[PDB]
Amino acid sequence: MAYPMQLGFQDATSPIMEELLHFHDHTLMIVFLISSLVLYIISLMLTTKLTHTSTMDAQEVETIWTILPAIILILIALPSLRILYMMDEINNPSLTVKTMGHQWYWSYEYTDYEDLSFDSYMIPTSELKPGELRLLEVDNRVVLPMEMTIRMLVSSEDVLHSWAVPSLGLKTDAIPGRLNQTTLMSSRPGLYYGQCSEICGSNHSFMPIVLELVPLKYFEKWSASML
Amino acid sequence: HETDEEFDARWVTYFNKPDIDAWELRKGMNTLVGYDLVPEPKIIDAALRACRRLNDFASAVRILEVVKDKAGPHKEIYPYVIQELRPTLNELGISTPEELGLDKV
Amino acid sequence: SVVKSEDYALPSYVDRRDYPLPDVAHVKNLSASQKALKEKEKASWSSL
Amino acid sequence: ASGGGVPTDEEQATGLEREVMLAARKGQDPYNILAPKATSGTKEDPNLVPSITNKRIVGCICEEDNSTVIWFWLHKGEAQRCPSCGTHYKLVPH
Amino acid sequence: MFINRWLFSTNHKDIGTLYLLFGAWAGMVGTALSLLIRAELGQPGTLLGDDQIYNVVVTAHAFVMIFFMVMPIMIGGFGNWLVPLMIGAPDMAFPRMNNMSFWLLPPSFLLLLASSMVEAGAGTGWTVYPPLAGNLAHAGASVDLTIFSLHLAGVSSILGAINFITTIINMKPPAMSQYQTPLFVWSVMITAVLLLLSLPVLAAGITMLLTDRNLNTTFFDPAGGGDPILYQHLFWFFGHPEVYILILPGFGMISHIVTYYSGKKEPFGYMGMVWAMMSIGFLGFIVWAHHMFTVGMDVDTRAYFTSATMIIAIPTGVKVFSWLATLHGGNIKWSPAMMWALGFIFLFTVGGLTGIVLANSSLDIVLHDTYYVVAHFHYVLSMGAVFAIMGGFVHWFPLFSGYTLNDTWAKIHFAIMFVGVNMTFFPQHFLGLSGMPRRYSDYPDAYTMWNTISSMGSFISLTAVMLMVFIIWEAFASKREVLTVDLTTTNLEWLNGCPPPYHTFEEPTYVNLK
Amino acid sequence: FENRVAEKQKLFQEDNGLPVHLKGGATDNILYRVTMTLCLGGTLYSLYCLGWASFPHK
Amino acid sequence: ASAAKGDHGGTGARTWRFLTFGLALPSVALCTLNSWLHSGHRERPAFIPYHHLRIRTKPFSWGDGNHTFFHNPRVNPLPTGYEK
Amino acid sequence: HQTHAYHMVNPSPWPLTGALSALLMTSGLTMWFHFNSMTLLMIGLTTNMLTMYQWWRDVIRESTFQGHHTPAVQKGLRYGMILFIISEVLFFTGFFWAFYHSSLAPTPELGGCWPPTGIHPLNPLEVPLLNTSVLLASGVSITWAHHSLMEGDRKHMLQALFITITLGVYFTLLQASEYYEAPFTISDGVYGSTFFVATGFHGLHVIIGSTFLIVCFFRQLKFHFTSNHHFGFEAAAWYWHFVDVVWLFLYVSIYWWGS
Ligand SMILES: CCCCCCCCCCCCCCCCCC(=O)OCC(COC(=O)CCCCCCCCCCCCCCCCC)OC(=O)CCCCCCCCCCCCCCCCC
Ligand code: HEA
Ligand code: HEA
Ligand SMILES: CCCCCC/C=C\CCCCCCCCCC(=O)O[C@H](COC(=O)CCCCCCCCCCCCCCC)COP(=O)(O)OC[C@@H](O)CO
Ligand SMILES: CCCCCCCCCCO[C@@H]1O[C@H](CO)[C@@H](O[C@H]2O[C@H](CO)[C@@H](O)[C@H](O)[C@H]2O)[C@H](O)[C@H]1O
Ligand SMILES: C[C@H](CCC(=O)O)[C@H]1CC[C@H]2[C@@H]3[C@H](O)C[C@@H]4C[C@H](O)CC[C@]4(C)[C@H]3C[C@H](O)[C@]12C
Ligand SMILES: C[C@H](CCC(=O)O)[C@H]1CC[C@H]2[C@@H]3[C@H](O)C[C@@H]4C[C@H](O)CC[C@]4(C)[C@H]3C[C@H](O)[C@]12C
Ligand SMILES: C[C@H](CCC(=O)O)[C@H]1CC[C@H]2[C@@H]3[C@H](O)C[C@@H]4C[C@H](O)CC[C@]4(C)[C@H]3C[C@H](O)[C@]12C
Ligand code: CUA
Ligand SMILES: [O-][O-]
Ligand SMILES: [Cu+2]
Ligand SMILES: [Mg+2]
Ligand code: NA
Ligand code: NA
Ligand SMILES: [Zn+2]
Asked: What positions are modified (N6-acetyllysine) (chain B)?
């Protein structure tokens, strides 16, 4: 989850999120460099009483400031597209889980073997247990086996929603009549939080997502007990 | 393409034209100060003598001011140019902006 | 001296360090003594 | 059955349209439809600028393909010069 | 006479004045809506109500700022005032149709206001996506009033686009080619082409939404074989060209302002500036699905839209470096308009660069629908489009009115606004990177510090807006009349005096061919 | 039919100061007044309807 | 293509009238014949209350709310089937 | 007095009455959809027609009767009409995009096929083919009308323009009968939605274009057009060719390919 005064991304929970962090560091360095260079040149242009107001020939310098930005874009696009296709690569999941968006809560279905499904609602602020997080806890978490490739399928039974978990680098729109696929792999046990990410009406702010990542044997016994 | 010496000689020739008129004097000076340079003394000499032929003392003083202005923070250029121009200034009776108090704010 | 709204289409005076010799004189009308001064300017400036 | 019955512009054009049509036939351009062609622009051979009043705005494209146009009022009287290239213009009021 | 002049106008300057007054009034509405947003978010908890009242405010904020403030001011206001003067034309091509483009806008705004007064308002986002905007989740008249508001705004701009394109192609002096027209005129022409092509596609899409809501069509309803994602394609096919429509006249004004207060006769690299605006206009039609990277799109499509979007940095960079090259060697005048334009160059660049971050579809998965997007587009809109509007307003107010502003007050105003907008939006990068979603009326506690700072910033900008009104009042109250304006030889719009007569260029300029 | 464009040209070029939308004669004024009355009265009525629709009606 | 016709020299009204009466209107006449031969009602199919058809998410703003604007009782069933 | 050739238009109330008619039509559609009343809509439609009538009346007064349409003004109107047609092309492009989106990827609710299960399309070789021959023929007859006008031939201009209009009316009557006879409706899922909204906007433009041709017909009867100056006729012919080409795209896409 986010922590107070956080500046950057949540710590990576999946390998793909770690790739995004390194790619963001690379790109932000370029953003900082170009922003600062423009600010500096502005200040340079503005700090001399020397003048030159006759016509200036443009042809030569426009090669530089077309070619250099093209090279920079290529230096961004290459790692960007590598992560894109790596994100997309075949992986073979062990488990498929569906989530259906609703106004205003998520339901989950684990129907590879038995018919397991339940609803997952925000815990109201007045009912939080001590130390629990306002607007983020749910009554029934999405328990999942850690260190395993999971196929998540996302849809909606009413308006658009969007199923997001920032620390796993996940955001997949929930569209009625459509079944969107994404894959999820947590390197670590724990609790990983997200929030509905497409405006969906009166309680858009209040239908969060909580994944609970545990060893397979715990997940199996939990699954059986939820039938 | 044009050497510095060729550029300077074109400008000397321009101002040296015996019957240069007032419009051409102004056109010349207002064009010249657009360039990335302080004009050589020999150019300013010719412009000052054009002022003399046009009976225009004030524009001669103004030309000296714009030499100082074109040097920007390079405070050494203007005293050098005035030094080089002192024989002309004395010959033509041109007082410097400093001698006239016109450097005061 | 006095600039008028209805003069907007006429050459005008400006103080601009990059336009050192403006299109008109600052003062167009001369008194008797100023006329005599412009005559004296036709002689050696060392005598001013 | 090739017949007639459609008026021509010569018969039925009116107002400003008719003025433009009749002047073009005389080779005249009182409504400024054509670009004027420059003279050499010397003081001896200034560009002659027609006007129905005593001043007109000139735009001077100093050199072919300049994208910058130099604009100034041209007044009745002695020829004036473009402030950028010096080419001469003289007002011809009528 | 008053009705004849101001309700029956066929005059490009008076109609431009009408647009500027309309856009200034809309800007107050949009500012109030922005302060309600930031009041709701200025401390954790609920201030106003749940997300419905909150997102009616958010939705109206965006429509007001875009359709009733920026486009009327830039295109209807500066475009009508300046374009005919900059080409020496006696008016617009269709001067009476021009007046209808203006008078469609108060009814369009009334329809938006009606949408928010009836039922529970249209709490949809300015994108108006179904099914949230459909007749089950937004039953009643509000969304239909919003659709009709957009229809009228769209007709207004399409007819205005026809007018500007025709005027600029057909009514220049016969010797003036398109490569001798000023960059602001170019910027308006290209904006008008984008409007002409994009708004009919929006109109098609919102009409389909109207029939799904009222005639039992199912364009966007899977029960009938429709698709909500089809709406998104049609909307964003308009909506990306639209943000270039919002910035291009700004680019044109910035070119004029930077040239003027650098003491230059011309912008650096004129044909490169024309090339860059045309290239941006063209590339702006082939990138729209970067608004849709999370909807479930194939990987190769994501790769294409990532790359096509990033290419726009190349012509945009030519413009930024050409502005800097225009400053280079200038006799710099530190006028208030110049301050607006310098702030523009820097802050627009920051916002453009965060747009390039978002163009990367892999990073956009995590950043989409978060405040990182909000930060990107408020740097290009609140510190880009608006900085260009303020710069042009301060620069050309003496032309339009014949009176001068107080420059010290105008510099004070710039300083306050600059602190305010940066305090508002810079922390929203942190909120986006750390996962705060868009269109939320409240946030998990961790996000409190940057939301508190952001809201405090929005109040500083309010103080700047109030001071702006006083500054305009002071100018009209004191009546300092303009005398001389420098650089008229390269700024034709000033050459008829301040204000110009009702009819200008009754005798056209003389421009020969050689 | 005969060609009577010439007489319409005389009518609409008469030097009477009228704007083109009133220059045909008294019928122009009537049609104008009808148009503008319907537009302004209709606009007031639309505002009444907004007033009505802005409140719940059980 | 040059089509299969072929008559210029200085285009004109006479040629376009030739085309109007010699090609365009004869083609309309042929298509008018073809259509009058193949008109005559077709058997209306069994009614099946498919959920992607006869959509009603809001009553129509005319009639009883349940009839489309150009409702044809012979061939347009209601959500409940053909009318009596 | 001006010495350029452009038209300074008299101050006019029709922009305002047109804008208010737009307010009344849209608030009127809202009132009809949600408050069971046609009152505001009928007022808006009425003031819209009055506005269009007096505005285009005035344009005729300004040109035929007052001579303000110099060649420069006419050239501007040419650009204006071309740009207007371009905007209308893009408007139809949005409906063709909706049609191809839904038909190339038919969803499970449809049966996963196009045409959807339960849809029985019209036979494109019957009335749709006839309608195609009718609009194509009218493109030939309007070209004859144009050439007769340029050649100064009043009678054959009128004959050809009358035949063009008759064919426009024929298309509209045929399309109206096909709408009534169609066994599917606008509420029959995305098939009926795309079919009727796209051909419906097309039919509206046929009616608009036919009305424009009829305006030209009566101005021609009154001798307004010269053999060289008749932009209203040219504009109506361009718009008519636009209506014909949109029909050919509809025919190939929706009636034939989508059957
Ligand atoms: C650019 C707009 C103008 C500036 C507006 C306000 C200026 C404020 C400074 C701001 C002056 C610029 C410095 C920016 C970086 C500061 C925060 C940071 O360390 O960023 C880190 C990253 C994530 O990194 C991490 O995950 C590691 C975390 C490390 C923690 C170390 C502790 C830091 C102490 C707390 C810092 C508090 C931040 C202050 C909060 C500030 C509240 C306003 O976050 C981000 O990417 C934020 C992404 C921003 C993207 C827009 C870039 C615009 C650059 C313009 C600069 C031009 C020249 C500068 C000089 C610019 C001078 C004009
Ligand atoms: C003025 C309006 C404006 C402008 C000009 C832009 C310009 C750009 N925008 Fe922005 N954008 C918006 C307004 C604007 N945007 C709005 C309103 C939204 C949200 C809509 C909504 O959802 O409500 C949005 C959303 C948006 C998204 C979707 C994000 C998401 O929803 O998840 C993306 C993604 O690619 C994007 C990218 C860009 C890019 C690449 C540019 C480029 O044009 C920027 C190019 C400029 C530069 C790059 C800076 C100058 C260049 C240099 C100094 C050269 C050197 C630089 C490099 C080599 C990189 N924008
Ligand atoms: C031009 C566009 C524009 C502008 C200028 C602004 C200005 C501001 N916006 Fe806006 N905003 C949007 C367009 C704009 N916004 C859009 C499109 C959205 C997304 C909507 C959606 O999600 O559906 C949005 C969303 C948005 C949000 C996110 C809401 C959410 O996700 O829940 C927030 C929150 O802080 C915000 C705040 C502000 C603030 C504090 C300002 C302040 O900077 C405003 C300060 C005041 C001004 C900038 C002056 C305005 C007036 C004038 C310029 C008139 C001048 C008069 C003369 C020249 C005579 N905006
Ligand atoms: C939900 C329902 C919403 C309904 C909203 C309706 C909104 C608007 C109400 C419209 C009222 C229209 C009244 C008639 C307007 C005629 C305009 C016209 O004909 O304008 C002409 C120019 O536009 C030209 O040519 C070419 C352009 C002609 C445009 C004609 C009008 C089109 C209006 C609709 C446009 C929609 C575009 C849609 C594309 C998606 C003439 O220009 P003027 O400046 O007048 O004269 C100049 C003089 O020199 C003439 O002698
Ligand atoms: C410019 C923005 C405009 C936004 C437009 C929004 C839509 C407006 C249409 C609403 O019009 C109202 O509808 C009511 C319902 O039809 C009418 O009351 C009618 O019905 C009431 C409820 O049954 C009864 O109390 C009355 O007898 C009867 O007048 C009422 O008079 C009418 O004005
Ligand atoms: C040829 C054309 C116009 C030149 C003129 O007639 O004045 C110029 C104007 C802008 C130029 C382009 C811009 O300067 C940007 C690019 C600069 C690179 O150095 C070459 C390609 C590049 C894409 C240029 C190609 C070409 O020289 C352009 C397109
Ligand atoms: C986004 C749009 C589909 C819109 C729709 O679903 O209605 C589709 C239609 C045609 C597609 C394009 C064409 O298939 C051609 C290209 C195919 C490449 O694999 C991706 C880019 C590429 C340029 C495509 C991008 C995108 O998927 C397009 C533009
Ligand atoms: C009255 C007029 C004669 C030409 C003139 O006025 O000088 C004639 C010539 C062309 C005739 C029209 C055209 O021949 C086309 C139509 C033919 C139909 O049989 C009658 C109406 C129809 C529309 C004719 C009516 C009328 O007889 C017209 C208009
Ligand atoms: Cu569910 Cu937002
Ligand atoms: O839209 O960026
Ligand atoms: Cu975009
Ligand atoms: Mg989203
Ligand atoms: Na809150
Ligand atoms: Na013709
Ligand atoms: Zn010149």
From this structure: 42, 68
Looking at the structure, tell me whether residues H98 and H190 fall in a common domain: yes
The angle that helices H71-104 and H231-250 make with each other, rounded to 10 degrees, is 10
Enzyme catalytic residues of E: 61, 91, 126, 156-157, 240, 242, 244, 255, 290-291, 316, 319, 438
Domain termination residue (choose one: H68, H103, H127): H68
Domain of residue E275, residue span = 2-514
DSSP structure class, residue A122: B
d(CA E15, CA E18): 5
Q: Could you tell me how many helices (H) and strands (E) chain A has, helices first?
A: 3, 10
Residues with CB under 5 A from ligand 12 (ion): A 198; E 369
Question: Contact at 8 Å (CB) between A122 and A207?
Answer: yes
Atom number in ligand 4 closest to CA E94: 44
Residue D67 CA to ligand 6 center (angstroms) comes to 15
**Which pair of structure tokens corresponds to residue A59?**
């042809």
Same domain, H92 and H191: yes
Q: How many residues does chain C have?
A: 48
Q: What CA–CA distance (Å, rounded) separates E332 from D69?
A: 22
Residue of E213, E223, E224 with shortest CB distance to G58: E213
CB E174 within 8 A of CB D34: yes
Q: How many Cβ atoms sit within 10 Å of the Cβ of residue H200?
A: 16
Closest Cα to atom 31 of ligand 5: F49
Closest of H55, E224, E158, H216 to residue F19, by C-alpha: H55
Q: Which of A2, A9, A14 minimizes the C-alpha distance to A213?
A: A14
Interface of C with D (CB under 8 A): 9-10, 23
**F9–D14 CB contact, under 8 Å:** yes
CATH number for the domain spanning E344: value is 1.20.210.10
Cα angle at D53 between D51 and D55, to 5 degrees?
A: 80
Closest alpha carbon to A70 in E311, E271, E282: E311
Residues in a beta bridge with D59:
D71, E511
- Are residue H56 and residue H138 in the same domain, yes or no? no
Query: Would an 8 Å CB–CB cutoff place D83 in contact with chain B?
Result: yes
Contacts of A76 (CB under 8 A, 6+ apart): A26, A27, A30, E310, E356, E360
For Cα atoms E221, E225, E229, give the angle at the middle one, nearest 5 degrees: 55
Q: Can you give the residue ranges of every domain in chain G?
A: 1-84
Asked if chain C contacts chain B via 3 or more Cβ pairs within 8 Å, the reply is yes
Instruction: Tell me, letter by letter, the H, E, C secondary structure of A52-95.
Output: CCCCCCCHHHHHHHHHHHHHHHHHHHHHHHHHHHHHHCCCCCCE
CB nearest D5 (choices: H4, H69, H154): H154
Q: Contact A51/B73, CB-based, under 8 Å? A: no
Residue in E279, E265, E102 with CA at minimum distance from that of residue E186: E279
Taking residue B71's Cβ as centre, other Cβ atoms within 10 Å add up to 19
Cross-strand pairs, A209: A194
By what technique were these coordinates determined?
X-ray
**CATH numbers and ranges of domains, chain A:** 2-91 (1.10.287.90), 92-227 (2.60.40.420)
Residue F16 per-residue DSSP state: S
**Backbone conformation region of residue E419, classed left if phi is above 0, alpha if psi is from -120 to 50, else beta:** alpha
- In eight-state DSSP terms, residue H123 is -
- How is chain B split into domains, by residue range? 1-105
Which helix (H) or strand (E) element contains residue B53?
helix B41-53
The residues, any chain, with a CB within 8 Å of residue E386's CB and separated by 6 or more, are: E70
Q: Which residue is closest in CA terms to ligand 10's atom 1?
A: E240
Distance CA E153, CA E126 (A): 14
- Residue A122 CB less than 6 A away from ligand 9: no
Q: Do D14 and F13 touch (CB under 8 A)?
A: yes
Report angle CA A215, A220, A226 to the nearest 5 degrees.
125
DSSP state of A123: P
> Which parts of E are annotated binding residues for O2?
244
Going by alpha carbons, the residue nearest to atom 2 of ligand 10 is E240
